[PDB]
């Protein structure tokens, strides 16, 4: 069972090293995904992260929606939008038949606050044919489970045809109770290129 | 033992992905920690970091003490302070009872010189009630062990009562022999919020 | 007594023209003093910024700490720090044995608000052998008197030996009641050069 053990460990480490899933993320910014920032909800503005230079207050820092399609998931490296429901529009690096989506949040064990009440809870993903279409085709309704694993995957609806999309809108309909903001660490889009 | 093997592997990987410890780091900058840069010792001018924009190299700079509370630990991503003694004050993201501290340094196997003589050796940690307090409460005296693991954990002294702190001072008294500077990769503060 | 009257008046005017004191100010910037801005308290953050760039407001401050070692004391030409406690570190134009210090604030009669509650109240002066020295040597504890003259002079502690300093720290422990900030118009350092 020793060689089998080494095989299992190498298999697990290999999967871990492949963005934890082994699947293309067509939303990933470095590979060509981008935020359509004029179609995102309002960013939550605190005046509490002060950047200064030589002691001179310079500007108040807050994360942009771009971090949602970047891999770092240390606490705080998330996009905070105002209130408890909102939306984000992402342009994918390729025209794809979307098959699945991934949402990540920090685990409770790493949250300074003791909780992850700012995590998305109820959400839906829609495919948009052009950047001006408002509702789009529903690709699925889901819930991020705050008692579940940090990384969660969700299968897109099986539909008789296969329509391809290069724009998807993530609509967050609720969070896990934080009154001020909702924090999105990472959203991935998986599927098959055309 | 196969299902058990998979469970052991998954448990190890899960702990690894949670900042290697599974514990909140209340000093972490992205989560709300801050350096009190007016209360740090002198930065050593290494000027070994290159700054570019649009691919055009512009100039060389030295790492600020902020890197002590940021997670990247590739060789060179450390704060070098002058000589073998120094101090760093960090404001924590919450008011906590401190339980433990972590110091990381690169392993000797990744150091070009073969040694980690620039690593901190003897140090102590103090709790401060406000950022103007000169004399803090001793939370522990420790040595970072150059023959030990890269990441080392140190247990706080727990006072008979419970005073909480939101400000911590790290005092480094010595290093592992480098005459010019000491290089600090990461310092974490763990504990229980009030 | 007429010639004596002229003599008294000329004496008063001569002293007035000699920076009101007739004494070298080793902190005066134009004469070689400098603020060590990385060791000073953070400048007070005003509600609004001075400009914007790419839609981001920039520069939330009124005056830099340099004004503390410049002679103009019209209302507003003072350095404001947050709250009622703070510190300023100054490198003198020469190595001296410090003998006395001066603090100026505007008179109540020139204050737009009618009061000078933002003036420093209780303060101390320390000599530093290096600007990164953590604990300085106490040169004196004093109170600026809001019912006194605009310019006030304070005698340094009488030392058994004579240690010279070229760096001094001014610590303000309190103000005359303003909750938001404390405003420092001018601090002078007098003494004998080595």
């Amino acid at each position: 069972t020793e060689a089998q053990a080494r095989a299992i460990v190498n298999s697990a480490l290999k999967l871990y090293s492949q963005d934890k899933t082994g699947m293309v993320d067509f939303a990933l910014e470095s590979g060509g995904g981008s935020i359509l920032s004029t179609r995102c909800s309002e960013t939550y503005e605190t005046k509490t992260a002060l950047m200064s230079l030589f002691g001179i207050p310079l500007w108040y820092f807050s994360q942009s929606p771009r971090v949602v399609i970047q891999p770092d998931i240390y606490p705080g490296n998330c996009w905070a939008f105002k209130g408890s429901q909102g939306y984000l529009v992402v342009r994918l690096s390729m025209m794809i038949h979307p098959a699945a989506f991934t949402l990540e949040h920090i685990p409770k064990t790493l949250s300074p606050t003791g909780n992850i009440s700012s995590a998305p809870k109820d959400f839906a993903v829609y495919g948009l044919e052009n950047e001006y279409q408002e509702e789009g085709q529903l690709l699925g309704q889901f819930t991020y489970d705050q008692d579940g694993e940090s990384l969660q995957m969700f299968q897109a609806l099986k539909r008789p045809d296969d329509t391809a999309f290069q724009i998807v809108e993530l609509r967050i309909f609720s969070n896990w109770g934080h009154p001020e903001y909702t924090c999105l660490y990472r959203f991935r889009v998986h599927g098959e290129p055309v | 033992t196969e299902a058990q093997a998979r469970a052991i592997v998954n448990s190890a990987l899960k702990l690894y992905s949670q900042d290697k410890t599974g514990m909140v780091d209340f000093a972490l900058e992205s989560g709300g920690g801050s350096i009190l840069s007016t209360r740090c010792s002198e930065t050593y001018e290494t000027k070994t970091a290159l700054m570019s924009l649009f691919g055009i190299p512009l100039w060389y700079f030295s790492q600020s003490p902020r890197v002590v509370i940021q997670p990247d630990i590739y060789p060179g991503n450390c704060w070098a302070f002058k000589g073998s003694q120094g101090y760093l004050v960090v404001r924590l993201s919450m008011m906590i009872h401190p339980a433990a501290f972590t110091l990381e340094h690169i392993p000797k196997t990744l150091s070009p010189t073969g040694n980690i003589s620039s690593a901190p050796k003897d140090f102590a940690v103090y709790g401060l009630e406000n950022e103007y307090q000169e004399e803090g409460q001793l939370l522990g005296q420790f040595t970072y062990d150059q023959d030990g693991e890269s990441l080392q954990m140190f247990q706080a002294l727990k006072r008979p009562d419970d005073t909480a702190f939101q400000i911590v001072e790290l005092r480094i008294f010595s290093n592992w022999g480098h005459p010019e500077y000491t290089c600090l990769y990461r310092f974490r503060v763990h504990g229980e919020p009030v | 007594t007429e010639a004596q009257a002229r003599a008294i008046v000329n004496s008063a005017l001569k002293l007035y023209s000699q920076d009101k004191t007739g004494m070298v100010d080793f902190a005066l910037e134009s004469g070689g003093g400098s603020i060590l801005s990385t060791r000073c308290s953070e400048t007070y953050e005003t509600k609004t910024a001075l400009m914007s760039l790419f839609g981001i407001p920039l520069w939330y401050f009124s005056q830099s700490p340099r004004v503390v070692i410049q002679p103009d004391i019209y209302p507003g030409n003072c350095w404001a720090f947050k709250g009622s406690q703070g510190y300023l570190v100054v490198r003198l134009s020469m190595m001296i044995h410090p003998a006395a210090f001066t603090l100026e604030h505007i008179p109540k009669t020139l204050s737009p608000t009618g009061n000078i509650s933002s003036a420093p109240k209780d303060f101390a002066v320390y000599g530093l052998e290096n600007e990164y020295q953590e604990e300085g040597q106490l040169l004196g504890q004093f109170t600026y008197d809001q019912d006194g003259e605009s310019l006030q002079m304070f005698q340094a502690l009488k030392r058994p030996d004579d240690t010279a300093f070229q760096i001094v720290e001014l610590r303000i422990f309190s103000n005359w009641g303003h909750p938001e900030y404390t405003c420092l118009y001018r601090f002078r350092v007098h003494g004998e050069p080595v």
């Binding site: 605190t46 994360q63 606490p75 | 920690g33 924009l53 | -």
Partner: peptide, 26 residues
Amino acid sequence: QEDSWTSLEHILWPFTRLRHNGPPPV
């Protein structure tokens, strides 16, 4: 427009000091 801001922010990041006056969103 804000691509310009983020590349300026990249330039500025290592040289500024960051102080939290309250908990950031996490």
